[PDB]
Design a protein around this ligand. Structure first.
Ligand SMILES: Nc1ncnc2c1ncn2[C@@H]1O[C@H](COP(=O)(O)OP(=O)(O)OP(=O)(O)O)[C@@H](O)[C@H]1O
Ligand SMILES: Nc1ncnc2c1ncn2[C@@H]1O[C@H](COP(=O)(O)OP(=O)(O)OP(=O)(O)O)[C@@H](O)[C@H]1O
Ligand SMILES: Nc1ncnc2c1ncn2[C@@H]1O[C@H](COP(=O)(O)OP(=O)(O)OP(=O)(O)O)[C@@H](O)[C@H]1O
Ligand SMILES: [Mg+2]
Ligand SMILES: [Mg+2]
Ligand SMILES: [Mg+2]
Lengths: 117, 483, 434, 160, 137
């Protein structure tokens, strides 16, 4: 579900930020308070492993939830989707507003086992 | 270190973990526990005290109400049986279980406490050896294993956790010789509340009574006589035994004697009442207080018909005295700071408000929209007999009842209010005005049941109250019974 | 004008009920109830008698209001005689009620002149030690008491009613509930220890009770403003005329809602948006702001949401509704609704509307789902409690694993309602018929 | 009522209602106020316009969609209320409380009581507006959650 | 031994006195003979409602009682709370058990259900011996 997605992501965020250089709540406010608690700007890269096996309703809600971090001025978010079927399959499994959000800055990178032989 | 979650409100007691079997090196190393300053029972009361700045006016009925509070004329055979079993098992230094069952308020706890008081008086006269009395109420425990924490704390004075307490009690009851012991009488009140899934607590408490060195009296007070047959195993039923003591609900003559015993010194007695304030003094006007024998008799007969519960009879008499005292204080204007009788009228009014139903008069005082909802619901139960009706069918049938009786005066004045709230700038609405409000109001009242569904049309609704009292409330209304 | 400001502020204070205690407004139909409550408090705080009583009435029927008024009245004259413990059945659980009682006991006893220290077993043992020249009366107010009269085990109610019965500490317990048959919720021993004192809260029975309550709400009885007498004259002229707009709105509330808080929530911005005294008198004579308020309260319902739809959204909704009406179970999906939609576009164009492609109708379909026009078939929706919601959050439903064009939906508004509220001039009106 | 009504286009009625309900005086302010509208109806925009046009009002802004569950929402209420009261009155010595101690609604009542009792030296009574922008956008929502929040004001002290 | 010393060698009779004191001796006929004619009528309507509905709440049992004794038009009807009161009398006598269970409908909620623990032959014999108010059997 989305709650476990956010909790695991925030535990990973706090663990990495503590490992580089007081407990916190593992929700998006840690993203809000990251500059106060660590003194640095934040760049999160989300790597969604095996996207063609995930529940697309959960993934859509998690992306819409991650959209709320855009107003915090010190956070930038990158998303990586590992697609194994086709882009058009994951297009029809997501909401059209989510597609319009993803369309603002996206690139395709094709690396199969024999891309160009 | 970085935690995955936190437990920041942990409150842990100062309870040790080592059981009593490791307290001395051998069985022979155990001293005489009676000659120990912590065994067998060898601060908050003043915080609820203050200084009184006024003088409370106690009226003439206040002594009647005080004497009718819950704080042994009808229990002779039960008292004698419990006392004889406990006396025989204490004086011969044996362990036994006594089983007592009954409905609420039939004098179970009072009789057992009186038996224990008389046994303590006999042990103070050196006719039976000394014993320690422990009262464990299963409804006063937070956790059911806390009885293990309670009993051992009453025996040794230590504070252990529950498993160590259970091992300590097992070692104590089984291995400690009788010359180093004191007898323990344990009252297990609300015995059904200590029943758990594994039934280990029940087995341990009734199995310690089968040990030869235990010197333990377990008096188990229950609510049903068939509790070991219904809820317990064969092993615990064998240990509890065949002899069980039933506390029957009181007949009306014994309730009559109970109420007369609470009012032996007050009834047909004279008081000096001060007409300036209302304060009455038991032996300025000389007023005789009286409560009718017919009133007490009819209250006792009613209560013995219902339950035979002495709490109910005392409460009915106290309520009648309260009603009479309210009328007396209203007619004299006394405040709080020749014959006063509490009559059979006050007793009947006390007996009637417990038997009156507010559901019909609640439904007759609702708005027209809620009554229209209930009327359409009853119409749908008459049409198809399903007893569960979808809310969309109720919407359609309300709309049908509005457009069919359109020539009615009240309906043709109500239609604009129902569908536009009396406003030309408001569009015609698919639900009536206050549809959600009366739906939620009938759900909070408990008149209605609604299934947990997200589609508002196919969501079903059921009457939770009886259908004929809803029909009576609908026929009470002028508009609905004419259409 | 500072005089109109003082009058407006006092009117808002009377509407919110935040007057001082001796100026507090008690409606006439609430009087004989509240005196009854006034007896029980005065028998517990003053005369040290123990009482148990349950107040039974609907939401916003002045249970907390009358109880708070009684406690405020007793606090002005007898403030060292009693302490107050407040429990709410939504907020307190069976574990946290014990900690709530102990924490409130210590912060009230230190206010008059630890119990809550340790584990919950020790806390409950200390509460039973304390509770099981004069005595301080402990007053319990137990809102939503039906939640603690559960079918499983009513431990707290047992111990509290035993404190009423057998303890020497004077305890007053006031329960509050909306459940009419609250006495059937109680366990046999709990009901035996309860006094069966149930006070059913009074209901509005006729129109002049509501008119008198409005008159008590809006009459200013103190000299706070130069405008007080003229406002009182204007208000009495409005309420005495049976053909006035105020009496019409009060009558409409009496026959639909029968709720004075519902009327107060509309009257408050009528007073607050007035800029001077003449505007306030005009607003109370016309009551046109009440019509604007009533229109706004209905603006987001099914009727008002329909009028915000575009023509393509309305066409897709109409097509889905007639497919659902033709279905035996009322179920439909995106494919059947699109097929019905293209049949209506070519049937209209044969007699020119852009025919939108299936890849563009997906956005319209998602908007219609989000606007609560379609619901997923046999969906439970919002769960009643957090435990069922947590159970539902760990399960993947079959609707969320199939492609979106095969998901089964049901209508929140049927085709007959659509024919009822779509205007005749609309060019998709003829397809609301079958 | 002494407050400013900003000019918000096509939302004049809503802004007049916000001026009717939201004021600095706690006696003529409701304990609960609901703004209801679908997505993009300008609810957040006009609440922003109203509170920026009235900077003397003390508003705390929370997003329940960033908190997902009830327990982080309770902890966020305690954390943001305590931080806002710290920056509002810096000359008031306060004992700091840990927001992670709030694990129950009752614990939120106790923590808010303990935070509010160290501010009784203030002269006037003061509203603290806690704005839950998107209450029903919380991902773990159930029907019983909102009842606790609307009955929360009855457990806080009345003369605070 | 306890029975012997509560009255004063132990005879044959005292074993039978024990086996009469500590067995309940249900005796449905003598329970029924202590009832009133009205209480017998409510008991008959209750067991008929359990016969034809097989999971009946107190409200549906009261509903059936109202319609069944308005079909007869004798012994003019009483209200729901006093119906529950005679049900409590019947539970005190030892014929009726009221429990708190869940419904099996679409609206699954808790509700009070009514049940019996009496033999049908003694019931039918003892209210055919009444021989006036027949059609509730
Ligand atoms: N024989 C009696 N004489 C006088 N008062 C009595 C008698 N029996 C009961 N009472 C009164 O009724 C109260 C209830 O009795 P008791 O506590 O023994 O009931 P119980 O059978 O243990 O009930 P429950 O199962 O509800 O605990 C007593 O405290 C006392 O006030
Ligand atoms: N302490 C108080 N001071 C002023 N007004 C109050 C107070 N308590 C309640 N009110 C008002 O009294 C009216 C009646 O609501 P009240 O809270 O008394 O209902 P209630 O019967 O307790 O409801 P519920 O069953 O939902 O708890 C409302 O308009 C409310 O705002
Ligand atoms: N009345 C208005 N005047 C000017 N701009 C407006 C107005 N209403 C909305 N907007 C613009 O539209 C944007 C979206 O509105 P807003 O964020 O307030 O919607 P919302 O109803 O709160 O949405 P959501 O529920 O999705 O959060 C605003 O940021 C603003 O740029
Ligand atoms: Mg007892
Ligand atoms: Mg209330
Ligand atoms: Mg917004």
């Amino acid at each position: 579900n989305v709650r476990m997605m956010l909790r695991r992501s925030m535990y990973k965020l706090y663990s990495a930020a503590d490992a580089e250089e007081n407990d916190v709540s593992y929700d998006l406010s840690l993203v809000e308070n990251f500059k106060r608690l660590f003194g640095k700007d934040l760049a999160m890269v989300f790597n969604f492993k095996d996207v063609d096996s995930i529940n697309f309703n959960t993934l859509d809600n998690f992306i819409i939830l991650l959209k709320s971090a855009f107003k915090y001025d010190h956070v930038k978010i990158s998303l990586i989707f590992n697609i194994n079927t086709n882009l058009s399959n994951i297009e029809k499994n997501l909401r059209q507003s989510t597609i319009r959000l993803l369309k603002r800055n996206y690139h395709k990178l094709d690396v199969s086992s024999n891309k160009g032989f | 270190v970085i935690r995955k979650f936190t437990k920041k409100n942990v409150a842990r007691a100062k309870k040790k973990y080592t059981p009593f079997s490791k307290r001395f090196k051998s069985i022979a190393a155990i001293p005489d526990l009676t000659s120990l300053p912590e065994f067998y029972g060898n601060r908050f009361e003043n915080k609820l005290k203050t200084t009184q700045k006024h003088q409370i006016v106690e009226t003439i009925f206040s002594k009647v109400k005080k004497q009718l509070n819950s704080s042994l004329p009808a229990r002779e055979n039960e008292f004698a049986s419990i006392y004889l079993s406990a006396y025989s098992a204490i004086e011969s230094d044996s362990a036994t279980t006594i089983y007592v069952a009954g409905t609420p308020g039939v004098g179970k706890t009072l009789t057992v406490r009186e038996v224990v008081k008389e046994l303590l008086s006999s042990s103070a006269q050196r006719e039976i050896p000394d014993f320690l009395y422990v009262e464990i109420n299963g409804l006063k425990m937070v956790k059911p294993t806390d009885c293990y924490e309670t009993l051992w704390n009453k025996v040794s004075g230590e504070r252990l956790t529950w498993a160590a307490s259970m091992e300590s009690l097992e070692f104590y009851f089984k291995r400690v010789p009788k010359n180093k012991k004191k007898t323990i009488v344990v009252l297990l009140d609300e015995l059904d509340a200590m029943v758990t899934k594994s039934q280990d607590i029940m087995y341990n408490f009734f199995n310690w009574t089968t040990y030869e060195n235990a010197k333990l009296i377990v008096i188990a007070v229950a609510n049903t006589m068939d509790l070991p047959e219904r809820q317990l195993g064969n092993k615990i039923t064998s240990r509890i035994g065949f002899t069980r003591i039933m506390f029957t609900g009181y007949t009306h003559e014994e309730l009559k004697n109970i109420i007369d015993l609470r009012l032996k010194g007050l009834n047909d007695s004279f008081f000096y009442v001060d007409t300036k304030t209302g304060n009455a003094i038991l032996i300025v006007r000389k007023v005789r207080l009286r409560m009718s024998a017919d009133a007490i008799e009819i209250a006792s007969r009613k209560v013995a018909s219902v339950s035979g519960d002495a709490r109910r009879a005392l409460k009915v008499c106290k309520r009648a005295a309260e009603i009479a005292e309210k009328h007396y204080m209203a007619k004299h204007g006394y405040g709080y700071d020749g014959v006063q009788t509490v009559h059979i009228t006050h007793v009947m009014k006390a007996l009637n408000e417990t038997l009156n139903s507010h559901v019909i008069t609640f439904m007759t005082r609702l708005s027209f929209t809620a009554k229209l909802f209930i009327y359409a619901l009853l119409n749908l139960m008459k049409k198809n007999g399903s007893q569960e009706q979808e809310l969309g069918d109720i919407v359609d049938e309300i709309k049908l009842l509005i457009e069919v009786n359109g020539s009615n005066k009240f309906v043709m004045e109500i239609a604009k209010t129902l569908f536009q709230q009396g406003s030309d700038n408001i569009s015609e609405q698919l639900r009536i005005i206050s549809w959600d409000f009366v739906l939620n109001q009938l759900l909070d009242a408990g008149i209605l049941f609604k299934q947990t569904m997200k589609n508002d049309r196919i969501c079903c609704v059921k009457l939770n109250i009886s259908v004929e009292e809803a029909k009576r409330a609908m026929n009470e209304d002028e508009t609905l019974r004419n259409l | 004008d500072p005089g109109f400001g003082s009058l407006q502020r006092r009117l808002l204070q009377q509407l919110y009920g935040t007057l001082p205690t001796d100026e507090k407004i008690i409606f006439t139909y609430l009087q004989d109830c509240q005196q009854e409550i006034d007896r029980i408090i005065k028998q517990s705080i003053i005369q040290k008698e123990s009482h148990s009583v349950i107040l039974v009435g609907p939401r916003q029927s002045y249970k907390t209001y009358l109880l708070d008024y009684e406690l405020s009245l007793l606090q002005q004259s007898y403030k060292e005689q009693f302490i107050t413990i407040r429990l709410n059945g939504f907020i307190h659980s069976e574990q946290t009620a014990i900690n709530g009682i102990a924490t409130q006991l210590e912060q009230q006893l230190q206010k008059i002149h630890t119990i809550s220290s340790g584990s919950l077993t020790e806390v409950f043992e200390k509460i039973l030690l304390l509770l099981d020249i004069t005595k301080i009366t402990v007053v319990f107010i137990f809102d939503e008491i039906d939640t603690f009269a559960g079918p499983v085990r009513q431990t707290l109610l047992y111990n509290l009613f035993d404190m009423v019965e057998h303890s020497r500490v004077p305890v007053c317990i006031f329960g509050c509930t909306t459940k009419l048959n609250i006495l059937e919720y109680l366990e046999k021993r709990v009901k035996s220890r309860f006094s069966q004192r149930v006070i059913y809260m009074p209901q509005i029975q006729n129109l002049d009770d509501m008119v008198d309550a409005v008159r008590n709400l809006l009459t200013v009885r103190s000299e706070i403003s130069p405008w007080v007498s003229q406002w009182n004259e204007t208000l009495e002229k409005e309420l005495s005329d049976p053909r006035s707009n105020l009496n019409r709105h009060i009558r409409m509330n009496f026959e639909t809602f029968r709720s004075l808080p519902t009327l107060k929530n509309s009257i408050i911005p009528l007073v607050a948006t007035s800029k001077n005294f003449g505007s306030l008198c005009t607003a109370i004579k016309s009551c046109s702001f009440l019509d604007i308020y009533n229109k706004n309260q209905l603006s987001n319902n099914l009727t008002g949401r329909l009028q915000s739809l575009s023509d393509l959204e309305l066409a897709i909704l109409i097509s889905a509704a007639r497919v659902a009406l033709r279905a035996k179970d009322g179920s439909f999906n995106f494919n059947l609704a699109y097929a019905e939609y293209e049949k209506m576009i070519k049937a209209i164009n044969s007699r020119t509307i852009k025919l939108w492609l299936k890849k563009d109708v997906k956005n319209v379909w998602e908007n219609l789902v989000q606007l609560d026009f379609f619901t997923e078939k046999s969906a439970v929706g919002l769960r009643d409690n957090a435990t069922a919601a947590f159970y539902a959050s760990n399960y993947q439903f079959q609707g969320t694993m199939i492609p979106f064009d095969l998901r089964s939906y049901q209508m929140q508004i049927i085709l007959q309602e659509l024919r009822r509220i779509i205007p005749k001039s609309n060019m998709y009106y003829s397809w609301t018929q079958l | 009522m002494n407050v400013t009504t900003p000019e918000v286009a096509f939302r004049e009625y809503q802004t007049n209602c916000l001026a009717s309900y939201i004021s600095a005086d706690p006696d003529i302010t409701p304990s609960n106020l609901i703004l209801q509208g679908y997505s993009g109806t300008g609810k957040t925009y006009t609440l922003k316009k109203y509170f920026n046009a009235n900077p003397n009002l003390h508003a705390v802004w929370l997003e329940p969609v960033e908190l997902v569950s009830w327990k982080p929402l309770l902890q966020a209420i305690a954390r943001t209320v305590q931080y806002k009261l710290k920056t509002l009155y810096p000359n008031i010595p306060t004992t700091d409380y840990d927001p992670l101690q709030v694990e129950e609604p009752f614990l939120l009542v106790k923590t808010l009581h303990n935070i509010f009792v160290q501010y009784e030296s203030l002269q006037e009574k003061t509203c603290l507006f806690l704005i839950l922008d998107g209450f029903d956008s919380l991902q773990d929502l159930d029907a019983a959650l909102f009842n606790k929040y609307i009955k929360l004001n009855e457990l806080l002290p009345k003369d605070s | 031994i306890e029975i012997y010393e509560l009255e004063k060698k132990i005879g044959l009779n005292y074993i039978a006195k024990v086996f009469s004191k500590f067995v309940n001796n249900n005796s449905t006929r003598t329970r029924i003979a202590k009832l009133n004619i009205q209480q017998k009528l409510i008991l008959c309507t209750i067991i008929q409602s359990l016969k034809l509905n097989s999971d009946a709440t107190i409200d549906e049992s009261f509903d059936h009682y109202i319609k069944a004794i308005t079909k007869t038009d004798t012994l003019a009807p009483l209200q729901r709370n006093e119906f529950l009161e005679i049900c409590t009398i019947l539970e005190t006598c030892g014929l009726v058990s009221i429990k708190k269970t869940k419904c099996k409908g679409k609206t699954k909620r808790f509700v009070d259900k009514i049940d019996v623990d009496l033999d049908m032959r003694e019931f039918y014999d003892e209210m055919t011996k009444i021989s006036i108010l027949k059609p509730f059997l």
